[PDB]
Structure 1
Amino acid sequence: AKLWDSKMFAEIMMKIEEYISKQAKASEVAAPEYRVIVDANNLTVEIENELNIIHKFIRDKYSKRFPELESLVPNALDYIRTVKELGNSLDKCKNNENLQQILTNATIMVVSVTASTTQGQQLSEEELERLEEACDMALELNASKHRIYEYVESRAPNLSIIIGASTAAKIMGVAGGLTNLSKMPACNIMLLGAQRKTLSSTSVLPHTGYIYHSDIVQSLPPDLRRKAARLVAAKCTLAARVDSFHESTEGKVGYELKDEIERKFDKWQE
């Protein structure tokens, strides 16, 4: 009913946002940049949700030809690519070179074995074309997501040294600029970008965002991740302040703080 409607609405929204992003990328060589950065950050979530609904649609449609494939390929993009590559003919697991670019040899064996005894029936040509167009829409949305992520990475030497460049951009955009970030307590920076995550509480990680879900924090055992978050946030705050005055542009402070964080992690894990 609203499948193509949502597809077109997201196409228009992504067209506007990607025009803005490509204009910024071209211009790389009162309407601040962090505004478009946060816009892209939320558009990423929108794209993820749209990809999820598209994946659900594809699963429901393809569950009559190869009902068992969903179990073997839990990942969304991999499942979409596999259904695109197999189509109505399940005899494409034999001597296939594209399938080896999506899955591992073990799961290729498993899917080939399962396809031989599946009890599924053929799809009509109309259903096949609907599935193909859905897959193409998913792939183009994924390409748009990749472009957004490239721009988001391209977009504060010390704060970036401590935590990447993507997370720094996310936290500064949600804060509303580097100056606004510099004048917040660390306990508030720790909570920038935290959802509510309705229960269906310990299993939800109630108070975590943009620092808990970071490369350097997720790089620890779960039981140490909250403490680490705190620590990182603390040091991040310091770096932010040093950045708000344009001092230590070489990143010396960031390197020192990262070394201290690494020493604390090592001591925790000894």
Structure 2
Amino acid sequence: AKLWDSKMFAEIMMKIEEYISKQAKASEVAAPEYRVIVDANNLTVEIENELNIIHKFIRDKYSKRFPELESLVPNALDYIRTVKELGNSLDKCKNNENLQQILTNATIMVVSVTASTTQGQQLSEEELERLEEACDMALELNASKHRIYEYVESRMSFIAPNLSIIIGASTAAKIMGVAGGLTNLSKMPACNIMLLGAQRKTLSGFSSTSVLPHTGYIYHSDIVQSLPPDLRRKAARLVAAKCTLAARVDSFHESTEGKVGYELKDEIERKFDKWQEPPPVKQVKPLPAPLDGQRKKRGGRRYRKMKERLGLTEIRKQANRMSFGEIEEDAYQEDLGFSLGHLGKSGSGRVRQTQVNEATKARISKTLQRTLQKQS
């Protein structure tokens, strides 16, 4: 089946290319190291794709057992670990100590609630063994990915010196692995690198801001996480841009000592200092003195419009006229202090009803109109 073919291909790749990477790692513990680095940084994408295939097959099989955990658990590796720790046993959902280390407490509650009253039937033995071998192979490939990322972190000093200087070596290895290579990452736009490894975390009733979406491995790097949250997202963008530059240098093997790395990290630190700088001293405006005499104010179309807007209207003029002697019943239960006066009252001197002056219509501001048009 698909699982068997994917597992066979993964084993064939690991017996040759992963073995070559292992020998290269053990050598430092004419076949230059560059080809080993490149084949490892392509192996990461190969194993990611085969793990995606494995995750799809596991989803297809487990939909019979639990057709809801896909939406509840978006991460593929987290899905595989969850089904490994669950299997056909859904009554195990209560107080799983092993589920804590994989899933956050917010979503363990949701998966337990869903499994309480789910319609998924229990799988048979053949499905159980198929799923178990699939999960075992998936976790083995995940371990292989972890080992190869450790190898790339070790080789960070050689593959991308400047980019390893800018950010953490682990972050650099992860971003090159997810991007597909040093060349593959260097060809990507700066606005895309910061989106690398941005898992679609599902909101568990919380707001989207709690999820922190559009956040990548750069957002979780060492330097970015050392900033106040209100200054985090912006910081990430900056770092991403500079990271891109490093790749666009490192992919062409320039400043192998890292001179561009320092020339970018110092300006990153400068930008961070400027953003975090204490606010300047701002004098307070003394209250203006009371006015006397006359100040000449112009008239014209604007003055006419403002006078029409703020002028007394006929219905408003009739509102504040209260009839002497003739008592009126208060038509506003919620407040006795409000009355229409002559408006609607007998003896008001108006046989017809006082019309509405549309010059006093309530309308939104210009900036509110702009925002509404944007939100449309």
Per the normalisation by structure 1, the TM-score is: 0.69
When residues 90 and 251 of structure 1 are mapped into structure 2, their CA distance, relative to the original with a 3 A threshold, is: same
When residues 20 and 218 of structure 1 are mapped into structure 2, their CA distance, relative to the original with a 3 A threshold, is: farther
More displaced stretch, 229-238 vs 27-36: 229-238
Q: Which runs of 5+ in 2 are unaligned?
A: 276-374
More displaced stretch, 17-26 vs 169-178: 169-178
Q: 1:257 aligns with which of 235, 254, 264?
A: 264
Deviation readout 1:167-187 (Å, 9 max, x if unpaired):
878999999999999999999
Give the root-mean-square deviation of aligned CA atoms: 7.1
C-alpha displacement of 1:4? 1.2
Q: Distance in 1 between matches of 2:254 and 2:52?
A: 44
C-alpha displacement of 1:143? 0.5
Indicate the structure with greater helix content: 1
When residues 220 and 57 of structure 1 are mapped into structure 2, their CA distance, relative to the original with a 3 A threshold, is: farther
C-alpha displacement of 1:204? 21
Q: 1:1-270 counterparts in 2 under 5 A?
A: 1-155=1-155, 158=162, 160-165=164-169, 254-264=261-271
Deviation readout 1:188-239 (Å, 9 max, x if unpaired):
9999999999999999999999999998799999999999999989978998
Q: Distance in 2 between matches of 1:204 and 1:94?
A: 25
Deviation readout 1:24-83 (Å, 9 max, x if unpaired):
221113311111101111110011111111111111111111111111111111111111
More displaced stretch, 95-104 vs 155-164: 155-164
Q: Which runs of 5+ in 1 are unaligned?
A: none
When residues 58 and 259 of structure 1 are mapped into structure 2, their CA distance, relative to the original with a 3 A threshold, is: same
Q: Percent identity?
A: 100
More displaced stretch, 197-206 vs 149-158: 197-206
8 Å Cα contact 1:175-1:192 kept in structure 2: yes
When residues 89 and 152 of structure 1 are mapped into structure 2, their CA distance, relative to the original with a 3 A threshold, is: same
Higher relative contact order (CA 8 A, sep 6+): 1
When residues 245 and 41 of structure 1 are mapped into structure 2, their CA distance, relative to the original with a 3 A threshold, is: closer
Q: Distance in 1 between matches of 2:200 and 2:79?
A: 29
When residues 231 and 110 of structure 1 are mapped into structure 2, their CA distance, relative to the original with a 3 A threshold, is: closer
Deviation readout 1:129-178 (Å, 9 max, x if unpaired):
10111111100010110111000110075553235446878999999999
The number of residues matched between the two structures is 270
Q: Distance in 2 between matches of 1:186 and 1:69?
A: 34
More displaced stretch, 194-203 vs 86-95: 194-203
8 Å Cα contact 1:34-1:172 kept in structure 2: no
C-alpha displacement of 1:120? 1.7
More displaced stretch, 214-223 vs 250-259: 214-223
Q: Distance in 2 between matches of 1:248 and 1:14?
A: 34
More displaced stretch, 260-269 vs 62-71: 260-269
* Structure with max Cα Rg: 2
Deviation readout 1:98-124 (Å, 9 max, x if unpaired):
111111222111111111110221111
When residues 124 and 171 of structure 1 are mapped into structure 2, their CA distance, relative to the original with a 3 A threshold, is: closer
More displaced stretch, 201-210 vs 90-99: 201-210
When residues 37 and 174 of structure 1 are mapped into structure 2, their CA distance, relative to the original with a 3 A threshold, is: farther
More displaced stretch, 187-196 vs 258-267: 187-196
More displaced stretch, 155-164 vs 191-200: 191-200
8 Å Cα contact 1:34-1:177 kept in structure 2: no
More displaced stretch, 86-95 vs 138-147: 86-95
Q: Distance in 1 between matches of 2:45 and 2:188?
A: 26
Q: Distance in 1 between matches of 2:62 and 2:212?
A: 35
